[PDB]
Amino acid sequence: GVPEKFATLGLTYDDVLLLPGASAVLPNAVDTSSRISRNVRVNIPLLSAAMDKVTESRMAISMARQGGVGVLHRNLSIEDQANQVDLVKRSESGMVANPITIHPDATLGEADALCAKFRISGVPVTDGAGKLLGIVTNRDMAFETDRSRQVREVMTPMPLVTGQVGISGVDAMELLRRHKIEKLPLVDGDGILKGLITVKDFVKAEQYPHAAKDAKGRLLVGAAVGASPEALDRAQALAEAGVDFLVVDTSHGHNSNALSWMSKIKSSVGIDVVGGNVATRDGAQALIDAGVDGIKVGVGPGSICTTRVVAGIGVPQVTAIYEASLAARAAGVPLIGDGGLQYSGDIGKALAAGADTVMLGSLLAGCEESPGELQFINGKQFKVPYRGPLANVLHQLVGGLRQTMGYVGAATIEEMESKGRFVRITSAGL
Amino acid sequence: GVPEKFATLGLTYDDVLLLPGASAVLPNAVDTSSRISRNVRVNIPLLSAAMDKVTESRMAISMARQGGVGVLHRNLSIEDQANQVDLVKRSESGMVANPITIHPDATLGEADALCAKFRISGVPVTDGAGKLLGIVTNRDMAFETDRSRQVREVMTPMPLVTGQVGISGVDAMELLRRHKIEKLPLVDGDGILKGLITVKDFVKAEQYPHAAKDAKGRLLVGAAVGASPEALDRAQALAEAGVDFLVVDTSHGHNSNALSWMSKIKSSVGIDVVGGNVATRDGAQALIDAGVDGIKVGVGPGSICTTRVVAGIGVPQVTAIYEASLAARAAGVPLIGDGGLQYSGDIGKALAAGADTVMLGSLLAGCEESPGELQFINGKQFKVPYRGPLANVLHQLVGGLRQTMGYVGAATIEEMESKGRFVRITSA
Amino acid sequence: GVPEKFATLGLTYDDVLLLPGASAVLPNAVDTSSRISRNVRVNIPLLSAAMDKVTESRMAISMARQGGVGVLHRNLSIEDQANQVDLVKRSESGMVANPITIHPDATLGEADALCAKFRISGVPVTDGAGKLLGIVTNRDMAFETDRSRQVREVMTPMPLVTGQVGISGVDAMELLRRHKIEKLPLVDGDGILKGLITVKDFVKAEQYPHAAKDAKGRLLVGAAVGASPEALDRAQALAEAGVDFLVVDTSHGHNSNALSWMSKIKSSVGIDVVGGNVATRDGAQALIDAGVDGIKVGVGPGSICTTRVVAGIGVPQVTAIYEASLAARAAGVPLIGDGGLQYSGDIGKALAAGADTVMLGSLLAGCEESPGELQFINGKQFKVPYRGPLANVLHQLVGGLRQTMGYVGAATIEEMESKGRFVRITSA
Amino acid sequence: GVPEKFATLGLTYDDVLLLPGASAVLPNAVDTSSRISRNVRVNIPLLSAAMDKVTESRMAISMARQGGVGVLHRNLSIEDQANQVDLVKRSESGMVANPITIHPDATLGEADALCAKFRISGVPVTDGAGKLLGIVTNRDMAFETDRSRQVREVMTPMPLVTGQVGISGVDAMELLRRHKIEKLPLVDGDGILKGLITVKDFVKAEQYPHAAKDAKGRLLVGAAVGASPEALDRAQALAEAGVDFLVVDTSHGHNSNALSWMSKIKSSVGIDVVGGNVATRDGAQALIDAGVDGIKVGVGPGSICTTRVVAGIGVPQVTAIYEASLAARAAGVPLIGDGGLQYSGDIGKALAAGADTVMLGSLLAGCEESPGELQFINGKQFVPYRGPLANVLHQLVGGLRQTMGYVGAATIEEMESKGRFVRITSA
Numbered sequence A: 001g002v003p004e005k006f007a008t009l010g011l012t013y014d015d016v017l018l019l020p021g022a023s024a025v026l027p028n029a030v031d032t033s034s035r036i037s038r039n040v041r042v043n044i045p046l047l048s049a050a051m052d053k054v055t056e057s058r059m060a061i062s063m064a065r066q067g068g069v070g071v072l073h074r075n076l077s078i079e080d081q082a083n084q085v086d087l088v089k090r091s092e093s094g095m096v097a098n099p100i101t102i103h104p105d106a107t108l109g110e111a112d113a114l115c116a117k118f119r120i121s122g123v124p125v126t127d128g129a130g131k132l133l134g135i136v137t138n139r140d141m142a143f144e145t146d147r148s149r150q151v152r153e154v155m156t157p158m159p160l161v162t163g164q165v166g167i168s169g170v171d172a173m174e175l176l177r178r179h180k181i182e183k184l185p186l187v188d189g190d191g192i193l194k195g196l197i198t199v200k201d202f203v204k205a206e207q208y209p210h211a212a213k214d215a216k217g218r219l220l221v222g223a224a225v226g227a228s229p230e231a232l233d234r235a236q237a238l239a240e241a242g243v244d245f246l247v248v249d250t251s252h253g254h255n256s257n258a259l260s261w262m263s264k265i266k267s268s269v270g271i272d273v274v275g276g277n278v279a280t281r282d283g284a285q286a287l288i289d290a291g292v293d294g295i296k297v298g299v300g301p302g303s304i305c306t307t308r309v310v311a312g313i314g315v316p317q318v319t320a321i322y323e324a325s326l327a328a329r330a331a332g333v334p335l336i337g338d339g340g341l342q343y344s345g346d347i348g349k350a351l352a353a354g355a356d357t358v359m360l361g362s363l364l365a366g367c368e369e370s371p372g373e374l375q376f377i378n379g380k381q382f383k384v385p386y387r388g389p390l391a392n393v394l395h396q397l398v399g400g401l402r403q404t405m406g407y408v409g410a411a412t413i414e415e416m417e418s419k420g421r422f423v424r425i426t427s428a429g430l
Numbered sequence B, C: 001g002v003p004e005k006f007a008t009l010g011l012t013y014d015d016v017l018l019l020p021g022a023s024a025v026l027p028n029a030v031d032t033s034s035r036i037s038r039n040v041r042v043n044i045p046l047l048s049a050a051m052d053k054v055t056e057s058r059m060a061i062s063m064a065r066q067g068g069v070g071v072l073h074r075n076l077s078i079e080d081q082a083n084q085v086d087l088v089k090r091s092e093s094g095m096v097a098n099p100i101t102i103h104p105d106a107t108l109g110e111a112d113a114l115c116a117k118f119r120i121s122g123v124p125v126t127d128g129a130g131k132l133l134g135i136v137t138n139r140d141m142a143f144e145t146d147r148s149r150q151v152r153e154v155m156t157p158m159p160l161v162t163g164q165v166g167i168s169g170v171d172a173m174e175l176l177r178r179h180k181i182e183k184l185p186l187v188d189g190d191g192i193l194k195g196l197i198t199v200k201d202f203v204k205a206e207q208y209p210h211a212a213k214d215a216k217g218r219l220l221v222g223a224a225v226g227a228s229p230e231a232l233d234r235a236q237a238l239a240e241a242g243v244d245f246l247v248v249d250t251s252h253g254h255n256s257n258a259l260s261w262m263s264k265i266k267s268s269v270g271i272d273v274v275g276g277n278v279a280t281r282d283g284a285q286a287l288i289d290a291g292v293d294g295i296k297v298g299v300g301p302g303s304i305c306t307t308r309v310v311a312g313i314g315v316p317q318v319t320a321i322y323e324a325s326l327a328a329r330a331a332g333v334p335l336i337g338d339g340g341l342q343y344s345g346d347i348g349k350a351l352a353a354g355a356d357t358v359m360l361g362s363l364l365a366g367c368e369e370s371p372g373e374l375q376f377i378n379g380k381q382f383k384v385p386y387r388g389p390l391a392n393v394l395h396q397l398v399g400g401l402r403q404t405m406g407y408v409g410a411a412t413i414e415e416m417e418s419k420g421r422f423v424r425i426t427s428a
Numbered sequence D: 001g002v003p004e005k006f007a008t009l010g011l012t013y014d015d016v017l018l019l020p021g022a023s024a025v026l027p028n029a030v031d032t033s034s035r036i037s038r039n040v041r042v043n044i045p046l047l048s049a050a051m052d053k054v055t056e057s058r059m060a061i062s063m064a065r066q067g068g069v070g071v072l073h074r075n076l077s078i079e080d081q082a083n084q085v086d087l088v089k090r091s092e093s094g095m096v097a098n099p100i101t102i103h104p105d106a107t108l109g110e111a112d113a114l115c116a117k118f119r120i121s122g123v124p125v126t127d128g129a130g131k132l133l134g135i136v137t138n139r140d141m142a143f144e145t146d147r148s149r150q151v152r153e154v155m156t157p158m159p160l161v162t163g164q165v166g167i168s169g170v171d172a173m174e175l176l177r178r179h180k181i182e183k184l185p186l187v188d189g190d191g192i193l194k195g196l197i198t199v200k201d202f203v204k205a206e207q208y209p210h211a212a213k214d215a216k217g218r219l220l221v222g223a224a225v226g227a228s229p230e231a232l233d234r235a236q237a238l239a240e241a242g243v244d245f246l247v248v249d250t251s252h253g254h255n256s257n258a259l260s261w262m263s264k265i266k267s268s269v270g271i272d273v274v275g276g277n278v279a280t281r282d283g284a285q286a287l288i289d290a291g292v293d294g295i296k297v298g299v300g301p302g303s304i305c306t307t308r309v310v311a312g313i314g315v316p317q318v319t320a321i322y323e324a325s326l327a328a329r330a331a332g333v334p335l336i337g338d339g340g341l342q343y344s345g346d347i348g349k350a351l352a353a354g355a356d357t358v359m360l361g362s363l364l365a366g367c368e369e370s371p372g373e374l375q376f377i378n379g380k381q382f383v384p385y386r387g388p389l390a391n392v393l394h395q396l397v398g399g400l401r402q403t404m405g406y407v408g409a410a411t412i413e414e415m416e417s418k419g420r421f422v423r424i425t426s427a
């Protein structure tokens, strides 16, 4: 009973429910892996948002360890954001081919700061030519009080227990078990340091068996850039640091200038580039025509959010995802749902509506791994209420998603769009 | 104005109303009987849910006395659940062919514990062959202080006033009246005890004239089982104890393994087997194809309930009942509405939408007959706010249904689906 | 304008404030040490209460490390409470003269369980005569997958780096630094194991420089007992495990039977015994006459708490402390304030009113170190809202007390009673 | 019915009321002048607190124009605080002997920045020796777009209408009127600039006839310093910039080290030094013995405030003022009531209890003249926006005049004797 100008009805997550369907698969047996972009895969379909209150290196590391991925925020210098990337890539199994080093004339303070930075308990000591001279570890410094003392005075000097480039995990773990050590430098025939294996690599692989990793076995990570000449310089620095994909993050992804920078940034790097944000079919198509490898969907998804109140602009998120998916699914381009979430059950709704993954934002701002210092004022806060470890949040969200997939009969994420049947509900049902 | 992926609108009870229609029948004259399953009938269209806070024997007994039926929960051992079944079946008129007995060397404590267990005021005393030796009753023990004293010392010994196998109610009552006694053992020609009638059988028949009973005149009762190998052992034990139907209770009735166990639980017993839960036409058809004698409908029926919040899964209950009824009515399989209730008027809505009965849940957890212990903390609670006797809840619910039926013109539940006309309403 | 029967006005913490006074001492320079009892001293004047939701070994260890002390609750078996004591006493520097050991035939699973129990990363391996055979540590077991494997197969055998009984801290650390090891077994001339030093002893001494310790350098701990024959057996078992003081915990410390058991318990052990609870001068004097080494003050201290509502019994806590201190100060017996706290500033008020230390209760139940299990239900809770590490609670409380002492001019706790001047305030 | 240790009852403003008394004086006729310290006088008995959200130069100027005084906060460098002092002292009539100047080689941007800084509409242009070359004013720059143009190109050059040092207000005004100009440079016989009069001096004197001023006719101002070697240097820098009194501002005024610095600072300057904070008779006496010229009273005056909750320390403010005044009134040392205010009626209560003036704090943080930036977020904010200070002070002073009329006090000094108190219950 409305004119055509107003015919379309937009739906939010609360407006719809998924129906139970014929199922031969239990929640604990479904596969939750999905694609961030054409060439980036995760083991749970969740990202942490590129917000300065949410994702720096510690959050990105935990997300990837749990099988998702973090998108490092860009509200910091190029050098600081690239450093955040490096910390993620060189977290565990990341020093097999790019180890940290220290010169023997350095102080213990410099060595300990490096150990704290990369969260590891030792540094190979090398000369200017990269020849291995020895190794200084936490135990060598445990009883040292003078931080000005030189590394050479406390390090364990060569000859050390070492391995060859390409040593297998089983063989490297047999040199840490036989010699009662936790570190294994990798050297070439001339004794030049080529890599480093430590017990951390094996401990973290066992504790986090579903970690999302790159082809080199290092934790996956993404990073946000803007749409500007500066964003191009930032993109290059992040690619050099080893980032696995870029997110060109704009409030209006359908702006022609933003689209142009997406194309320019994409053509200037060899890694996947995600573009956003859009909330319509034609906007998603414009991003695809601009060449992005994934799209991010969400413009004014939240009730009485800023763009809605200030500008009257917005799209209910189920409709936004569905409309964008008409273009994205037709092109085979993964779709990230970004905004409007209110329950773990909304994840399955997003996937059945056409999303491949879902980005989590303010929900992860109170988590231990988010940036900011934990402060105490009668209760615990992040300087936002303290929520505890990320792992507890993700376990509940992924547990919920597995329930949805079992109820719908989807053994894989790719089956969700076809097997998920929707019903709309009224405000009485809500 | 939505894409077809989202065309369907689901309706809950609050979304609709029933219209008044042409009527020639008053509320006090309508018939409220309905079917639980193909071969199980009740006198009011209501069940108590298989929740451990709701239905054990006391709840099941009261439900059946009021004309409904209870579904005994399964959060207990097979032997404990079978015992709950036995307590219901042998409540009133249930010992005519399976009496309790005690040996003459038993203590008064053992006899009184048996009386308390079955809520009967005496025990026939027999020897190892079943020969009736006497009877010990509440009055025989009233003034006794030593609980170790042997039954034989206080029992009334044979010869007793007894009845024959097959004695009628009228004849049994006349014997009780004439001899001013409350118990009538039933014996065969050799004096072997075959059954027992007590005044409770007549008192409860008069107090509860609409009791739901089996073909032998014993209170009806159901019991829940899971979907697993253990559920098959449980089913056999419950059937042996005299349960009238089984409810294969699963959260996702459309799961292939759950459906398979339904066909394995149904084919292994001779009593009716209900399956659930489903909320779609295709789900109901899958239950029917698996061979169940009734279906239970309800998946995420409640606003912001657990499956909805955790998993985003759910179906508004009016739509769920209607869609499932499209399959159930064509197959002649009764449909139990399980969940989403908020008012007594919702019962009539469920029936007009296609349900045959409605299962009551947390509503009843506060009733006197629920398993919890009544405790006092400034006010009364169950250890859940105390609601009082089940009878008060059912009286209001059944009274409401009779009003609906009078307004719609339905003289029977079976007329509700055709005569009940709906209108949707807005939030205003 | 009231009868003499009602002349006395009782004051709670909120009724009074402390005045600023002449001061030559800054908050960061005051001394916060005080006495729990005649012969037990702490570095901050705070105890954790003997409640089963608050203080087991983990809470007691953290309290002592921060300079206070925990009182282990008694809602568990005698052997379990004594085990809790043992865990505290042998936390750090507690195995120098009483080490844990394991047979060479024991499994890695058994060795790891012992390491987890005492929060130590290795076990000396000995024979039945206590002769040292080797040592098995976390690194020896790090890559092992079979938990049934023998410890002798993965352990480092003698000869080990060892020290003499009585080795100094500097000398032991020198051995750990030169041999790049974390353990130093202590042996006699015949190679019998006499003690164990590990890097934990040095790490924890550096991290917690204000730890409250006994004469042997082990963390202080108290434990609660009741007032009954069983409490006498419990007291002995706790004393044997190395507890530093006992708290006879009753709600009516002025009961003649409770007073009698305090004397009996006091006379049956050699360690300090605290008695409570009381809230009057005559009650404190009765505890003192019974022979206790400290008193605990608090009977119905909180507005609309249970004893007040149920029984109308209670004493505002400032009055309770002051009245009890009239007896306790004359006898030189320390006074523990137990209850009624609402602000960190109430600590200074209690001390100025006559308390020597203050017991903290439900405040701490939400701390990480409390016995409950940390669970996540949208937010973090203990099974009570999760508050985080004890250290921040104590840091805020001790910081506030230091502010109080600076304002009043008290350089030491005992100066609080004389230099702390009070003013009463109205509800405005 | 309590032990002697707890005998004393402390009273706050809400605990008491003043009685009406015999009165022959109406509210509009009472005199509201009082003393900040032995040698500093105000026309309304109110100060603005030395909080960085309350009093910088703009707040201090408005307070002084209304007859009170501001105490400039010290959460800034010595040179930044001294600059704040200079801005107040050289607000109106403050350049008669210390004018701003600019060189002919300066730009219009630099000239306009100076005019904006001192809120003056022109700058005398001088050479390096101070010889007057001309004057550049707002009207000279009104139509100038280039902000890099040199002042010499747009200034009015000498010969200007000038006056001599010591010219009277009446004579200076006649020159401004006769020549239809707003500026009057003051020069010596050699044409060296010695001072400056502008129309602002007369406009502001007429708009603010009760402006609290010093002996030279410049707006009064105070400034806070700490209790430390750095505060001794800060005190000298503030006294060189022309501050009229210092406030040695500590959370614990009865601390021996704080008292020692009060004595050291007092003896190192020639201006009045106020010390605080205290809340007892012995604390006030210790401040007096240290040599201060006024005391500030208030330690944990507010219900469930920080010092009360964290440390259990505090004194209800009526008791604090009364007890401190027992020492203050005996020595003739003025007493500043600092904290606990909740109504305009509490001012009269403070004065009747023994205070000479009352310091206003967070109340004023929302006023236009407070340091914060006025921002619009659906509504106006700085805390909520309160508008001009004048509106707050008008209501507060109006209330005090009502109190004095009801009590019969023609002067502030009569409040202590004529103000009769009654305590009230929570009912």
Ligand SMILES: Nc1nc2c(ncn2[C@@H]2O[C@H](COP(=O)(O)OP(=O)(O)O)[C@@H](OP(=O)(O)OP(=O)(O)O)[C@H]2O)c(=O)[nH]1
Binding pocket: A091, A112, A115, A116, A117, A119, A120, A121, A138, A182, A198, A199, A200
């Ligand atoms: N010097 C120094 N070392 C740090 C610091 N933080 C962590 N480490 C060390 O790096 C390794 C990894 O620490 P984790 O805390 O578990 O790493 P994670 O953040 O990536 O999860 C550990 O050594 P490990 O040898 O791999 O394991 P383990 O021997 O401690 O068991 C740890 O001792 C620090 O701030 N300074």
Ligand SMILES: Nc1nc2c(ncn2[C@@H]2O[C@H](COP(=O)(O)OP(=O)(O)O)[C@@H](OP(=O)(O)OP(=O)(O)O)[C@H]2O)c(=O)[nH]1
Binding pocket: B061, B091, B112, B115, B116, B117, B118, B119, B120, B121, B138, B182, B198, B199, B200
């Ligand atoms: N020894 C013993 N008897 C119990 C106990 N509980 C109930 N009874 C008796 O069993 C019969 C049923 O009691 P009800 O209370 O009416 O049974 P109900 O729970 O099934 O409704 C009564 O005897 P009746 O002869 O059938 O009726 P009446 O003579 O009491 O009127 C009653 O006295 C018990 O705990 N111990």
Ligand SMILES: Nc1nc2c(ncn2[C@@H]2O[C@H](COP(=O)(O)OP(=O)(O)O)[C@@H](OP(=O)(O)OP(=O)(O)O)[C@H]2O)c(=O)[nH]1
Binding pocket: C061, C091, C112, C115, C116, C117, C119, C120, C121, C138, C182, C198, C199, C200
């Ligand atoms: N096998 C085993 N060891 C445990 C366990 N819990 C703690 N530990 C070990 O005991 C020592 C104390 O751990 P903490 O966590 O600091 O002790 P705490 O509870 O008393 O504070 C550490 O070894 P350390 O050598 O003293 O310190 P470090 O080598 O880790 O630096 C730690 O590795 C456990 O559950 N199982």
Ligand SMILES: Nc1nc2c(ncn2[C@@H]2O[C@H](COP(=O)(O)OP(=O)(O)O)[C@@H](OP(=O)(O)OP(=O)(O)O)[C@H]2O)c(=O)[nH]1
Binding pocket: D061, D091, D112, D115, D116, D117, D119, D120, D121, D138, D182, D198, D199, D200
């Ligand atoms: N160039 C410039 N001038 C400013 C600025 N702010 C104030 N003025 C001028 O200085 C004099 C004081 O302005 P006020 O607003 O009254 O000063 P106030 O802050 O102390 O109250 C006025 O000139 P007047 O000649 O004394 O008065 P009138 O001719 O404006 O009436 C005014 O035009 C500024 O930011 N830049």
Ligand SMILES: Nc1ncnc2c1ncn2[C@@H]1O[C@H](COP(=O)(O)OP(=O)(O)OP(=O)(O)O)[C@@H](O)[C@H]1O
Binding pocket: A121, A122, A135, A136, A137, A138, A139, A140, A155, A156, A159, A160, A161, A162, A180, A181, A182, A183, A184, A185, C180
């Ligand atoms: N590959 C190696 N060859 C020789 N010595 C080594 C080697 N790796 C480590 N060390 C030395 O062995 C000793 C133990 O160091 P390791 O790396 O095994 O543990 P750590 O991380 O310092 O110990 P902890 O886990 O107790 O903090 C140190 O002196 C270290 O320098």
Ligand SMILES: Nc1ncnc2c1ncn2[C@@H]1O[C@H](COP(=O)(O)OP(=O)(O)OP(=O)(O)O)[C@@H](O)[C@H]1O
Binding pocket: B121, B122, B135, B136, B137, B138, B139, B140, B155, B156, B159, B160, B161, B162, B180, B181, B182, B183, B184, B185
């Ligand atoms: N069939 C019977 N023949 C003979 N005596 C009987 C018979 N049934 C019961 N009695 C005896 O009659 C007396 C009354 O018992 P009855 O069963 O009538 O009532 P009750 O339930 O014990 O009493 P109450 O209802 O007062 O609690 C008892 O001594 C009982 O032993």
Ligand SMILES: Nc1ncnc2c1ncn2[C@@H]1O[C@H](COP(=O)(O)OP(=O)(O)OP(=O)(O)O)[C@@H](O)[C@H]1O
Binding pocket: A180, C121, C122, C135, C136, C137, C138, C139, C140, C155, C156, C159, C160, C161, C162, C180, C181, C182, C183, C184, C185
């Ligand atoms: N006193 C000792 N003499 C000889 N070997 C020792 C001695 N103490 C420990 N070891 C051996 O040294 C190796 C290192 O053990 P240590 O006690 O130093 O700690 P760890 O178990 O390696 O701890 P971490 O978890 O910190 O790596 C182990 O093989 C242990 O058996």
Ligand SMILES: Nc1ncnc2c1ncn2[C@@H]1O[C@H](COP(=O)(O)OP(=O)(O)OP(=O)(O)O)[C@@H](O)[C@H]1O
Binding pocket: D121, D122, D135, D136, D137, D138, D139, D140, D155, D156, D159, D160, D161, D162, D180, D181, D182, D183, D184, D185
């Ligand atoms: N003492 C003076 N002698 C000569 N000319 C002067 C003198 N003072 C100002 N002028 C010049 O007179 C003109 C008017 O300036 P004046 O100071 O009177 O007002 P203004 O503050 O610049 O203007 P307005 O009040 O309109 O903003 C300007 O050219 C100014 O240079």
Ligand SMILES: [Mg+2]
Binding pocket: A121, A138, A182
């Ligand atoms: Mg290590």
Ligand SMILES: [Mg+2]
Binding pocket: C182
């Ligand atoms: Mg270690």
Ligand SMILES: [Mg+2]
Binding pocket: B121, B138, B182
């Ligand atoms: Mg009877």
Ligand SMILES: [Mg+2]
Binding pocket: C121, C138, C182
């Ligand atoms: Mg160790």
Ligand SMILES: [Mg+2]
Binding pocket: A182
């Ligand atoms: Mg280690």
Ligand SMILES: [Mg+2]
Binding pocket: D121, D138, D182
């Ligand atoms: Mg002008």
Ligand SMILES: [Mg+2]
Binding pocket: D182
């Ligand atoms: Mg003008």
